[PDB]
Amino acid sequence: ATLKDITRRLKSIKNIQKITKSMKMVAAAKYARAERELKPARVYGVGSLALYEKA
């Protein structure tokens, strides 16, 4: 394309990359919290399933 087409496309992709990096960071934080909260719920749910696999 022409120079302006390339410039606009490059700016758009740079914005997209910035946004995806930020979202990766947010998702990583939420993941850490989710694992932390998943351990106790893991034991709780496994216990609740205990009966059916035992009987």
């Binding site: 410039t7 606009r8 496309r9 490059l10 700016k11 758009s12 740079k14 914005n15 997209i16 910035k18």
Partner: protein
């Protein structure tokens, strides 16, 4: 060469149209809801 705010919709590529539609559908839905509420308020305030 840098990047600036509101550039995704300045390029007008696929992401620009995708974003425009993602906005328009949502705000059409909310406009419909608000119009329904406005009609309800109109009827309830006649008396």
């Amino acid at each position: 060469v840098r990047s600036s705010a509101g550039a995704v919709r300045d390029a007008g590529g696929a992401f620009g149209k995708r974003e425009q539609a993602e906005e328009e559908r949502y705000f059409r839905a909310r406009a419909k809801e608000q119009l329904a509420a406005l009609k309800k308020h109109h009827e309830n305030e006649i008396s």
